[PDB]
Each structure stands twice: as structure tokens, then as C-alpha cells.
Design a protein around this nucleic acid. Structure first.
Ligand code: CL
Ligand code: CL
Ligand code: CL
Ligand code: CL
Ligand code: MN
Ligand code: MN
Ligand code: MN
Ligand code: MN
Ligand code: MN
Ligand code: MN
Ligand code: MN
Ligand code: MN
Lengths: 105, 98, 84, 94, 93, 104, 97, 81
DNA sequence: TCAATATCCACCTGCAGATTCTACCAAAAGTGTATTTGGAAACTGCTCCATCAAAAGGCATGTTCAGCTGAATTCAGCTGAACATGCCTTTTGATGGAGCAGTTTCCAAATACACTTTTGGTAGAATCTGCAGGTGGATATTGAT
DNA sequence: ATCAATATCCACCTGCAGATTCTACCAAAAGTGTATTTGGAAACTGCTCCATCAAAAGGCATGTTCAGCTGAATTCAGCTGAACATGCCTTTTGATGGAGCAGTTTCCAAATACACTTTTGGTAGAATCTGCAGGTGGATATTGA
């Protein structure tokens, strides 16, 4: 009795992703590789942002990731920022950024 | 006495609020505004506390984001003082009134 | 209980000033404050209307945070943090 | 009893893999759950369309792959596609 | 088989509001795109509505809330009107 | 004896039904959903055709073309909002010159 | 020896082009550009006649729209001549940047 | 000889601007416009060809363009949806 | 104003290209049945929302006061419009040749089913801790001279 | 070209609101043995799609001139920022009643599943029709004087 995740070499739940697919009315039938492939991409993406959030935490001398850390990680990464360009992170604030023309001469 | 020149505290506040993430509109007052507006649409409505927070978060994220765009107009108009005219340009280009 | 009126005035000049700050605005014209309130009300109404529509559709009298999240999702303003 | 599922334990495991030393506040985990759910819906959504546009009644790992290429930008896509393929070939190795 | 469109229906409706008016094929193509788009938007939202409420079936009730959420003010009222009217008529005779 | 004549519609209730079921939107589809949806589609279709029909007339034209559907839509606030993100091929733009650009 | 003042013809073209609906970019040049760009994503591609047409329509509708928002900025900057910074402001507030 | 994007000429860009209500054009707008037009085409074409490649075809169809456009939030009516 | 260009604007006019109208077949759509459920209805366990009480001090409200920003004006440098020229790149209109969407027709591999075991996850308890909030000096950062 | 005046920073501290762990179930993955399809895989066709020609015809590329737009420099009137004095109103903490989600169960009305029977909508021809594009001839709108 091996979980599909271990067979897939994944942390994310393959069986759960599969269920969500069948129960989401996406298509009549769902292939066996579909949930495996999607669970992997999901896991890859959450790893990429936890990596950068963890850095932001570290940079700010905190050991526990909080929303502001997620925001700094998202907005400083051209790609994640693009991917989440219409997303609002509750409690994330904005990137500190003051237009040059506004500073004293 | 001692007086900071106009603009100095303003820049001080920008650095301060861009550094923090707390909500900038007082809680209760915002809750009344939401209830008033909600009430005018449907009576006897109730709200989960997090539902109120989700709206305030969304409202502040929206206003803040709108002020950045508006701030780009001002600077583009070679000014530094945001005016209704600028918020309008922004909402206009954003397609909230294209 | 009591009647709710003029609460948009509860969004004070200093609160709008703080929001403009986080938004990077350095100087604010005196007329900005009434515009902001105007813009805020339109935004709130729209989100409140759709949210309450999701509530009503679920035959509930309690607007949930999910209702608000779906309302915002409709308006192309996805919100992270209140999903469950 | 009313039990609600979440991607929390999985997010946490991955966190420990990348930053053994680091923890996460529940408000931050809340955001992560919204993210996983958002990307999942976007991918599945696109995969659904892709499948429909080709009169195909089934969503295979191939649909998920095109959806990922369509949704994610540059590098993110390529690394995701790599991980996806890698996980599938390994899965099919019994 | 082949390609089924909404052409004939758009046309019938055309003659109803403007019997003397015709419609270029490029214009018919626009209407088709229009009906498919609105169809997808409404069905898409209705789908979402049923899922949010753990329902497995899309009833006229979902189509209606969907219309309320998608059509602007006055367009929604009339749509909700026509909609309920057709279902009432369908249920009776 | 078809559902559309029974529903009193020009639009195909049977097709809208088949389209909903095979569209992967839900496990099951109510009997009135297709009737309703069909009625909503026919109504919006009449609304546009009506305004576009007028646009044609106001142009000494009897045949509706893209330009007409475009002027009908952009000149109508609600339709305009509803199709704000839509581009009508061959429809052009509403004639409009900013006052500040005119002479005198 | 008649000559129109600068801007008089400009206004005239505005009235003309806002009245018409024809594509404004020459087809062949466009087709050439399209295929060139497409060639970097997959080689030896063929194109449905309508695909090329759909594509050109979308582009021109996008540029005309972008020129409208850019004009709103120019009039906002109390100018009348669009400049690169104006297109750049519009694309930024639009979220394309 | 000459570049393909340069094929999109000044007069043509002028014409577009004009339909856009623009009364005066700076000389720098032409290179600027081509760059924007190029980024637009790249994004749309890339998506269209991805739908082409998924359908295992060699021919980009108007539908592939319509779907690409739909994803870029630029819905187009008149070509099959 | 007066006059000479060019621009628009009607009112007709006559095909060429689409449109509209016709005549017939597979493929959906409507039936008539026979089964299944989905999810409303009727209780009810019980979170979670609306309210109220109270006290405290974080902040909103007003006012004064004058720095410096936006609105006006004026000026002239030179950028971009209007044009008449001269030329060739795009338009287009057949002509084919053929690359290739779309079908067809098997079916072997891949999925969905229906049921039974088997864990992996989730909901609280029981523990374990970053770091929020505080304080003090060390370090600038400003702004008057 | 310093110096007061404040604001900003960093490090050191320590209890607790908020994470981590720890257990106990049971909802739902995993394992099996049939009963279906799905959708490739070759083999074929008619489309559509590039190529090729092959001219003309606008439509673009050029070089001049100069009107007038934009950017620079100056002014200065008045708005908006900074700093204070006040004391109001939000925030914080707790405690409750009960409105109303949410969980179960019971169960018809309504939806799904065939197996057929008919009807309709999509095609590939056949028979008009609407303006497009062209011609005047008549006031307009411009721009110079
Ligand atoms: Cl698969
Ligand atoms: Cl203003
Ligand atoms: Cl129904
Ligand atoms: Cl520029
Ligand atoms: Mn690591
Ligand atoms: Mn049941
Ligand atoms: Mn100034
Ligand atoms: Mn001069
Ligand atoms: Mn276990
Ligand atoms: Mn601290
Ligand atoms: Mn028929
Ligand atoms: Mn004509």
C-alpha cells in the first residue's frame, strides 16, 4: 500500500488533487498522470515562493514567515509578481518605493 | 522652536507607511460604512467578522493601489500634489470608466 | 439598532492621507478627500452587492468571508488570506 | 463534526525542505492555501478549456502541461514543466 | 455534424425587431461570438454558484443569480424578466 | 412541440441544454435552466439587434454591419459596460475629438 | 499657392479615420512580421486566412485603444503632442507594466 | 532590404493614432509604437501557437488566435467566438 | 469683409458580390419508460454575530502660520505638420502543387465502476516559543546660522 | 561648516498570544477484479495555404518651410504641510442571549438512462438586391489679404 505521492516522489497529495479534479467539473474523465503532474507543479510553485519568503524572513531577522514576507518575495520576483499581478495579499503591504522626483534636492 | 520644512514629514510618513502593513482606516468607522451600504442594498444582513476584514483589506489595497497610479499621473503632469483630476485620469485609463 | 447615516465621513482626512502615503503620494490637494470617499463608496457598493448576492443565493442571512472573496474574484481583484 | 481540508501539512513539509529553520504564521499559511487553490483552479480551468477545444473528454498530464505553459511565465514554466514531467515518468515506473 | 452556429436564431429575432432589416455575414459572425460569450459567462458563473453551494445541478435559480451578477442593472432586470417568463410559460402549457 | 415553442422562444432550448450538459459545468442540469438561459440569450440578442437596427437606419442602411453593432454597443451605457472588454472586429471607434484639440 | 495650417489636416484625418473601419496597417508587411515572430515559437507554421485577419484586427484595436489612453495623458499633461513617456504612462497604469 | 517590424510604417502608425484621436505625434513615437506592437504580437502569437501545438497541428487557426486573445483579456468577436 | 482653394455633401446611377431563398439528408431533439438521486423539509446541536458596559489614551479635529508649489505669462528655439516629388512595395488575381486538417476503422491501453480494506488528515488537547512591546543609548538626519 | 533638535536604529529583555506537537478517529485514498471507452495509428481526401507571376497603383519615403507647441525662466498668490492644544471616539476586554449556520435523516419530485421515432438545422445550389464607388453641381470651411 504505497501512496501515489510517494510513487510520484511528491510531498503534495496526489490522491487529493485527483479527487479535486474529478469533483471540479473540468472534464468527463481524468487521466492518472494529470493529478500527478498538477500536484508536482503546485509543489514546485509553493517551494519557489516559500524559498524567497524564507529569505525575506531571514533578511528581516525573523524566523517565522508572515504575510509581509510573502509580499516582498512575490513583488521582488519578476515572475511571481507577473503570475500574481492581480492578487492581493492580505496584510502584505507594499514594496517600499518613493519616486525620485519626490525626494529633496 | 524647531520646524521641519514642508515635505520632510510627508516623506517620513511615506517611508513609514510603506514599511508597515496594518490597516490604515479605523476599524469601527469602516464597519459602519459597510453596514450602511449593505443595509441600503438588503436589510437585516449579518456579517462574519472575517468578512468585514476581507472587505477592509480589499478596500485599502484598492485605494493604495489607486494612489500609486494617481501618483504616476501627478509626476507625469510635472506636479507633485495629487488632484481629483489625477485620480480621474487613473480610473479612466484603468478602465473603471474608460 | 439606530439609523446609520453619513458614515462615509468616518473615513477621515488622516486615514486617506495615510493611504496616499503607503501609495507614495507626497502632497495632497484639499479636494482629494471627497473624491476618495466617492471612489471608495463606489468600490464598496459593487463588492457589497455581489457579495450579498452570493449570500442571498445560498439562502443565508450572514455574509461570509467567502462571499466577499467570490465577489472580489468577480471584479478581477483576487484576495488571498480568508479562504477557510 | 464538520471537517475542512487544507494544503497546510504539505505546505509545511515543503517549507521544512527549503528552510529547515523557518516557521510560518497561520495568517501566512492562510495566504499559501489561497495561492495553491488559486493556481490549481487556473491550471485545471485552462486544462478544461484545452480539453474542450479539442473535443477530448479527458484531461491528461498533457493538458496540465499546456495549461502550465500558458499560465506561468518564463523560467517558472520551464521549471514547473520539468518537475511535472519528472514526477509523471517516475510515477509510471510502477 | 459540421459547424452549428446561432445564425438562424439571431435572424429570426432580427426579423422580429426589424422585419425590414438584414445582416451582413461579418455581422452575423459578431452576433455568434456574442451569444457564445454571454453563454459561457452565464454558464460559467452558474457553474461556480452551484460549486460554492455544494450543489451538483444547475437550475434556473443558478442561471438567474448568474445573470444578476453578470448583467448591468437594467439589463439584468429585463433578462430576469424574460427568463422567468419563459420558464413560467414552459411549465404551464 | 419543441421546448422552444413551448417556452415561447426563437432560441434553441434543446441546444442550450445539450451545450450545458456537455460543457462540463455541473453533474446535472435542471429542466428550466436551458429555457431560462435561452430566454436570456434571446433577450440580449434582441436588445443589440434593436439598437443596431436603429444604427443602420440612421445611416440610410437596411443591412446591419459590424460598424452598426459597434455604434449600438458603445453608445449604450449598459451594453458598453457588458462588452467593455470585447473588441468588435471591423467595428471601428465612436467618432470623438477632445475639445482641447479643436481650433477657433 | 494654398496651404493648410498645421493641425487642420490632422483634425481632418481624425474625423476620417474615426469614421472608417478598414485595417490601417498594410496587410503584407503585417503578415511578414507575424510569421517572423511566430517562427521563433514553432518553425514551418501555416496560417488560416482568418487567423491572420483576426490577429491584425486585435493589434489595431489594441493600438488605437492605447493611443486613446495616451492622448488622455497628453491632454492631462496640458500638452497636445503624444510622446513615448505618454504611451509608457498609459501602459503602466493599465498594468501591462 | 529592411527589418520586418520597420515594415510597420510611420504613416500607418499615424493612421492608428488618428483613429485614436491623437492630433500631434512626436518623432519618437514610431520606434516606441513598434516595440509595443512587437511585445503584443509576441504574447498573442506565443499563446496561439501553444494552442496550435497542443492540437498537434501545423496551422494556426483563427480559433487559436481567439483563445489566445481571450486569455490575454482581449476578447474578439467575429472569428468563431 | 472679399476671393480663391479645396473640402464636404447630396442626389442619382448601375452592377458585382454577397444575401436571401430553395430543395434534401444525417444527427440531434422529443418521446415514453424505468430507474436513481439531489437536495428541500423538519428537527436540532451549538458556533458565532450583535450588543452592551467601561475605561483609557491613541488620534481626529481645528487653528495658526508661512514655505514653496501650481497657475500665469512670456519667449524663442526647433520639432513635427503640410506638401509636392519620384519611386517601388503592396495589392490581387489566377494557377497550381501539395501540406495537412478531418475522417475512418480498428482496438490495446487507459478509465471508470462497485466494494472492501487501509491509512493519512483533521480536530482539538497539551506543549513549546518567536518576537511584540519596552527602554536605553548609539546614529544619524534636518535645518537654522 | 558646524551644532541643537529630533527622529531612527540596534541590541538586550521576557512573558504570552500563537505556533508546534501529540493523539484518536474515520473520511477517503489505495487495492482488486470487471465492464467500458478514448483517442491514437495508419491510409485517404479535398481543402486551404504558400509560391510564383506580373503587372499597375496607390501609398510611402524624401527634403523644404515654417507655424506654433513645448520647455525654460520668472512671478507670486494662496493652498496645503507642520506643529499644537483639546478631548472625543475607537479600541480592548468580557460576558451573553439567540439568530441562524450546519449536521442528520427521511424521501418525493425531478434528472438521468436508454431505445426509438421524428424533425430540424447544416449544406451545396439557385435567384435577387443593397450599396459601393463614381459622377456632378452646390454650398462649406479654410486661409490669405
Ligand atoms: Cl495522464
Ligand atoms: Cl482637479
Ligand atoms: Cl431547473
Ligand atoms: Cl518621451
Ligand atoms: Mn534551503
Ligand atoms: Mn441522497
Ligand atoms: Mn513650481
Ligand atoms: Mn519663431
Ligand atoms: Mn497514521
Ligand atoms: Mn520590537
Ligand atoms: Mn428544416
Ligand atoms: Mn456612397
Amino acid at each position: 500500500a504505497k501512496t501515489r505521492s510517494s510513487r510520484a516522489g511528491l510531498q503534495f497529495p496526489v490522491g487529493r488533487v485527483h479527487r479535486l479534479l474529478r469533483k471540479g467539473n473540468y472534464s468527463e474523465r481524468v487521466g492518472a498522470g494529470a493529478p500527478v503532474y498538477l500536484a508536482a507543479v503546485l509543489e514546485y510553485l509553493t517551494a519557489e515562493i516559500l524559498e524567497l519568503a524564507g529569505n525575506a524572513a531571514r533578511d528581516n531577522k525573523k524566523t517565522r514567515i508572515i504575510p509581509r514576507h510573502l509580499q516582498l518575495a512575490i513583488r521582488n520576483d519578476e515572475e511571481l509578481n507577473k503570475l500574481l499581478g492581480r492578487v492581493t495579499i492580505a496584510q502584505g503591504g507594499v514594496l517600499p518605493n518613493i519616486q525620485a522626483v519626490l525626494l529633496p534636492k | 522652536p524647531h520646524r521641519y520644512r514642508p515635505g520632510t514629514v510627508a516623506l517620513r510618513e511615506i517611508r513609514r507607511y510603506q514599511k508597515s502593513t496594518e490597516l490604515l482606516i479605523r476599524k469601527l468607522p469602516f464597519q459602519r460604512l459597510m453596514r450602511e451600504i449593505a443595509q441600503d442594498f438588503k436589510t437585516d444582513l449579518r456579517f462574519q467578522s472575517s468578512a468585514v476584514m476581507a472587505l477592509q483589506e480589499a478596500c485599502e489595497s484598492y485605494l493604495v493601489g489607486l494612489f500609486e497610479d494617481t501618483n504616476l499621473c501627478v509626476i507625469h503632469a510635472k506636479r507633485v500634489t495629487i488632484m481629483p483630476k489625477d485620480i480621474q485620469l487613473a480610473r479612466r485609463i484603468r478602465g473603471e470608466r474608460a | 439598532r439606530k439609523v446609520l447615516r453619513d458614515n462615509i465621513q468616518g473615513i477621515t482626512k488622516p486615514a486617506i492621507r495615510r493611504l496616499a502615503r503607503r501609495g507614495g503620494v507626497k502632497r495632497i490637494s484639499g479636494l482629494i478627500y471627497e473624491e476618495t470617499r466617492g471612489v471608495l463608496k463606489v468600490f464598496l457598493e459593487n463588492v457589497i452587492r455581489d457579495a450579498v448576492t452570493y449570500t442571498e443565493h445560498a439562502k443565508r442571512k450572514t455574509v461570509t468571508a467567502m462571499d466577499v472573496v467570490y465577489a472580489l474574484k468577480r471584479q478581477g481583484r483576487t484576495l488571498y488570506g480568508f479562504g477557510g | 463534526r464538520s471537517r475542512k481540508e487544507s494544503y497546510s501539512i504539505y505546505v509545511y513539509k515543503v517549507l521544512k525542505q527549503v528552510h529547515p529553520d523557518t516557521g510560518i504564521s497561520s495568517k501566512a499559511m492562510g495566504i499559501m492555501n489561497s495561492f495553491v487553490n488559486d493556481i490549481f483552479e487556473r491550471i485545471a480551468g485552462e486544462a478544461s478549456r484545452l480539453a474542450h477545444y479539442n473535443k477530448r473528454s479527458t484531461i491528461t498530464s498533457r493538458e496540465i502541461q499546456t495549461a502550465v505553459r500558458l499560465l506561468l511565465p518564463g523560467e517558472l514554466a520551464k521549471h514547473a514543466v520539468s518537475e511535472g514531467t519528472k514526477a509523471v515518468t517516475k510515477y509510471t515506473s510502477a
